Design a protein around this ligand. Sequence first.
Ligand code: ATP
Ligand code: ADP
Ligand code: MG
Ligand code: MG
Lengths: 166, 152, 364, 365, 530, 46
Amino acid sequence: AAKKYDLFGYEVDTNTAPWIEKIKKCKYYDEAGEVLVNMNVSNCPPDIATYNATLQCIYQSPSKQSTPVDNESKFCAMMDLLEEMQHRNRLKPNEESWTWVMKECVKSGQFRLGYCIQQVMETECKGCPADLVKANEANAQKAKTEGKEHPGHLSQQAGLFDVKVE
Amino acid sequence: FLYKAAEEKGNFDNILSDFQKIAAAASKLPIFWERTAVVEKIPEFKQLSEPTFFTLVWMQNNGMLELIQEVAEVYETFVNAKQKKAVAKIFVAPGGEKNVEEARRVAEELHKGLKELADYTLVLKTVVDRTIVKGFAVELAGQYVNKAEGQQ
Amino acid sequence: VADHKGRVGHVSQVIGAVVDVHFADGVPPVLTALDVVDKLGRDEPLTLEIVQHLDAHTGRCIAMQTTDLLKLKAKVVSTGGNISVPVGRETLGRIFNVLGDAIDQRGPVGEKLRMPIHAVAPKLADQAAEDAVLTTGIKVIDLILPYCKGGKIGLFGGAGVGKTVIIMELINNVAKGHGGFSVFAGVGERTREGTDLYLEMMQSKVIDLKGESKCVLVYGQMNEPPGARARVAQSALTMAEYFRDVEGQDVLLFIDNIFRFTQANSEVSALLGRIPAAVGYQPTLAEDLGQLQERITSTTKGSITSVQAVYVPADDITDPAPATTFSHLDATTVLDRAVAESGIYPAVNPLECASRIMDPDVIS
Amino acid sequence: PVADHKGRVGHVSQVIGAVVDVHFADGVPPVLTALDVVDKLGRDEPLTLEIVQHLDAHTGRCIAMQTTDLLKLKAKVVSTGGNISVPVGRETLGRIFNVLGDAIDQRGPVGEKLRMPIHAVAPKLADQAAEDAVLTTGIKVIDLILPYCKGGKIGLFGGAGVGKTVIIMELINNVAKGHGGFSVFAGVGERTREGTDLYLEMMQSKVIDLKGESKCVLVYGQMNEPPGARARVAQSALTMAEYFRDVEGQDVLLFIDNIFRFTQANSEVSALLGRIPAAVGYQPTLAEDLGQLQERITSTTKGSITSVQAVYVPADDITDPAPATTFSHLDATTVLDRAVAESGIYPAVNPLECASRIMDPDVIS
Amino acid sequence: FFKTTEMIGYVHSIDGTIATLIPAPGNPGVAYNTIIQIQVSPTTFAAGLVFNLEKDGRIGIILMDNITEVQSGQKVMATGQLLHIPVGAGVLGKVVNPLGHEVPVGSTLGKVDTGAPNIVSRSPVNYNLLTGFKAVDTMIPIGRGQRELIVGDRQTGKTSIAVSTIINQVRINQQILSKNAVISIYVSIGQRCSNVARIHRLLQSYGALRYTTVMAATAAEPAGLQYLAPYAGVTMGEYFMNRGRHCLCVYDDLSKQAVAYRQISLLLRRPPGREAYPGDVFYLHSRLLERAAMLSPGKGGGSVTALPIVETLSNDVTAYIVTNVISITDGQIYLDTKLFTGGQRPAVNIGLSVSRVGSSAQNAAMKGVAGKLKGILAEYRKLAADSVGGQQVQTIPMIRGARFVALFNQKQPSYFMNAIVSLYACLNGYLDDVKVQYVKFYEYLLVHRDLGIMYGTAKNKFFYMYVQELNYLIRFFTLNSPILHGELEEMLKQHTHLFLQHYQSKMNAIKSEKDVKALKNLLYSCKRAV
Amino acid sequence: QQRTSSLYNKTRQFGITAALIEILSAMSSLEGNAMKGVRRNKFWEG
Ligand SMILES: Nc1ncnc2c1ncn2[C@@H]1O[C@H](COP(=O)(O)OP(=O)(O)OP(=O)(O)O)[C@@H](O)[C@H]1O
Ligand SMILES: Nc1ncnc2c1ncn2[C@@H]1O[C@H](COP(=O)(O)OP(=O)(O)O)[C@@H](O)[C@H]1O
Ligand SMILES: [Mg+2]
Ligand SMILES: [Mg+2]
């Protein structure tokens, strides 16, 4: 509706619907990242809707790539995307992105990250979804009952000379 | 200088004959003759054409008597260009230039491909290349074709 | 042969950025500009500047860009004169290279005239008849080390002391007061710093794309070859001279740096093969610096003040380049980080600062 | 196989110092080619030349492994059919050789079943061995601060009067006598008296067993010898070591004293060859010339080479380009200090300036 | 339809690694800085580059391979094009020559020589690049698109710094998208093939080969190859830079490249200058480094970071090359032999090290922490200057500065979360009662393991050390925020109280011949572990 | 300290100049021992 000028005053393409459609049609969120790179090359800066679509693609995607990648984390990828959006583009995340993050945390079972995201949503957005909060609490209680509340070597008692510093 | 002198008379083959005489004289002459040689006192060169003798004296005065071969090559190039003859170098294994039909047909194909040489007539010059043991190579107007094999 | 424009020549020798040109009709004059018209699959135009004549037909030239993909016998066309640069108020708020071509990708210049790079310095009779003072609007500068119209100000200090801030404030104050534009010249300076300077100027509106711009920019970056790094300053000085004469104004020529200009000239001399003088600087150091500085003076028409940033190698003012630069400098301006750390802005050390018009003869 | 240039004939054209120009009507031989002068010239010794440059298709420029006395123009020279070759194998054990590989000990003919050219291509990246094993030299400072690595490279940087030669002899006595692998010594541009003393010490220690079986070989090109020999002697010894490494599969020791003479000799002839001086007077090609040799001196998959090189620092100025380049082609470096020597401390070693690659907890205790 | 190649002439002179060419009469000719093949054999060729074009028609050539196979009179052909090398994602994890050939170990084409971005194509440096070292990340910010020199002396860890920087990005690349991942290009010049092999093995062991490639021009290679390698590396980086991705080009080192260029020029009879380096050395380095930039958003957003390495002889920083490179670069990192021997590894000298880019390249939390850390270190240095010959007075700035100095010691890169947490603790004074010699053990216990769980005094919910995914949360929100501030302070208080109560008391109580040795070994192990 | 700094600067300048002079002398020798060119004169004019 309104033109946006770049750092040097040159205008940019605000029509990002085709790229959003491509992102939604992607399979692995690395492809969505590639699409964002292509948008940047083509001078079509991503918008809040584009970032939220990328987050949805991350959440709904099977994995980072067709082949497994060690220590991959949808939560880490989405947090990096949020940092890029807020800091290097001056765009405030909306409640949709935080809800997607909380959904990913619940699906993964990371109850601590769920608690942190709940606090963040309460602080900035207008609260955290009750369903997600309850799911996180249920996962935490299940872990507590099963005995996976905390790592094992941490619970293990070690003296001053017993710590096996590698 | 040699080309202009030859053009003034319309004859050029005399220059090439003089160069052949000079090559024979150099072969007969002792080692490192050009270092202290006097063309006037040299008996063989006394039979050369006036332009050739003048150029030899000039090169002797300047001390540049080792450039005869390159000067002859350049003069031959000028003569070939003037007469509209394109010379193709056929590099052949050391010993035996009988297998030249393939080189000739390749040179003809290259001449046909080179539209700028259509007016010129194709000529062949055989040169021994110690590097190659078998086959041959063809060069024409800078276009080089490799069809030879070396030692393994 | 008075009008050599359009004269054709053939490239005969190439070594690095040094090119030999053969003209059948006779070599053009010195400092002449040539262009390589042949299509060599080059992504950028290639132009050369004549510096020596080997013989009647052969001339030696230096390239302002890389000589890649250049073959012997390549065609060359003279431009009919020295290097040309656009002039006028159209240049305001625009970035230029040595060749007087905009690189901001912000439309054509629309210049109404072009002027040569190498122009003789003002004669003795054209000099100002009285020494004057430049009102910068800054208490410290206008009190302790007042500047002189048509003079040179040697600025010492790196980053973290607001050198760009001082430059922008000086331009703004000059425009608000004496009413004269400014010309900035980045010689052998970092591309990142040039970009940051352009962005800051646009933010401050001294260079307003949609409005009046008080400053012109000329940039020969370190990526550029020594010839361009040397001639960019002369181009900026040509623009300043046009403003001084045609418009009768008080212009400010900022240079960053002059040491880079000296280094580029030294590299050019080395490439041409002239044996280096002491340290390694070219023997023509003083003459080259003079041909630039003497063009900076106060005339009966207008004034061209200069502010030249100076870098002192090894912190030795005894070095020939800074010594020769000081011999031409009129006043000095020092920036110290300790002052900024204490919290005084602008960070200036008046004890170290000095000037020559600090005499009741000129000032009150 | 037989090189086509074997027996090729050339004539001497220009002579300047140790530099001689040779013209061949048929064609200039390949670079690194070895030529011998046929004319008697009244010389007590034969004259040998090595090609290093080509001035045209027919002309070449060469240096002389020996003196150029009684040398005339138009002198007849004949190619040897290949580069300079040296005998190899166990038949050389306990023997003394020169740059040309001819026995100089006056101890009888040597049975050579194979000659190898001095010039060889350095091993590639894939042909390298990852060995991290400490070595015990019996010296406290060396074994503590800068431990050596088996199959690695060691430099002894020092001036004059600091103890480089003494330390080399001490290491030889400590190690080479009991080391299973053989040893090769390179007396490059050093004192013939020191070489003789080393030979006598080896004979006393029975390393060189004339009646029995020896364990070391010597190659001596000294200061009296011309720069060509002083340069190519090290490469000849390195070829010997390379044969012992590859064709046999040993862990061979290689002591060199001193490498700096190689660069000095090359600089003596750079200008005559027609190369401008670069810095301090050294030849521009110093980096490549030293790097080729240093890379050839390395441990491979087949065998291992432990190299110890003495390095001379002119005026005790470590900033000199030759030592500066040498620093990067070594695993361990021992720097000597004239002040430490004056203080009576021997060996005069500056641990602060010393360094070692294997000084990591993973390798050593 | 034959395979025609333009023949230009024959070889006239050979001088080491270079050569001269005489053109055959009436030939098309060749351009400048182009590639040619010397026909040593009918099926084998040697690569060469054009460098001079004399008036007489003779040409100057720099050899690149099969030099020993070159002899006068051999034939020559010209490709007629500049030097293009393979580039793409299919090159990573491989060792390659500047000419593109792959070196045995046990996608498209890019020009080596390309112009740098203009003014309008660049953007201010904001994105941070992490080397994994606290000293660098705090006192000497490094941002993508920056050209930061590493100047030191022999045996000071210069190459180790860059290797650790490359390695520290492996985890980030694994976690975050490939879009923001960093692709590493390590260039070895005039170094030993053995050192190259060791580096390759280290990278393979740490798993960095996936996102890293190596360009080798080891000694025994021609000076032309050594001189060309860095430009090929920059081209490989630009391939990703123009495609909206971030690259890190490491050079080791420009000194040998300068030496090779000097050798070539002197062999080719070009006018020399200071130290015999011709006048084009500065232009060479400038055009090599200016290709590193932070592209504007409309150009793709990609970036290239330059980490050239330089060696100074006996701290002679006034050398021509060092001066030129320092003036060119956007800041320097100075390594000191004195500190290296004293134990500060890395041996960075903050006074001699600077980053012209500034704090704009630091993350928000790191920015805030550094804002105070820099002043604290300045005060500690000022007090230590006077404390040379007098008893010290244990003030808060001195204590915190000493603890920071002890923390800066490290062997391997440290994860951002652990580094920032430790720095915040030291800044806020949770270590004020901790001993300097035990800071490393304290940090090891705080990072690798935990004490709250062990002693059954856990009260936080989400702020725990073993949750390595909190790094991105910390990057998004500063530590001085209500979201994490309370949990962080509680955890630090608990850990400090437990340590002082249990471990430090025993340490102080140690009185024996074996317990002291065991404690010393433990301290050193922690020091070189974290 | 000031005097030593002055001497140090003087010494570095002198060293640089001396090295340049030596290299230039070598280049002058090499080039001037090969400077040549055909002379267009009357050799017959004896
Ligand atoms: N942070 C560090 N802590 C401890 N040791 C280190 C550290 N960084 C490097 N080292 C060690 O220092 C030694 C020299 O490292 P490196 O080769 O990187 O230094 P350099 O300055 O590049 O030296 P060179 O001239 O040999 O390349 C190695 O043993 C290495 O393990
Ligand atoms: N172990 C040692 N103990 C005492 N003096 C020694 C020792 N090693 C060397 N020196 C001193 O150094 C001299 C030998 O120096 P050397 O290594 O031969 O010098 P260069 O390295 O110049 O060949 C001896 O004459 C003695 O003065
Ligand atoms: Mg000795
Ligand atoms: Mg290193």
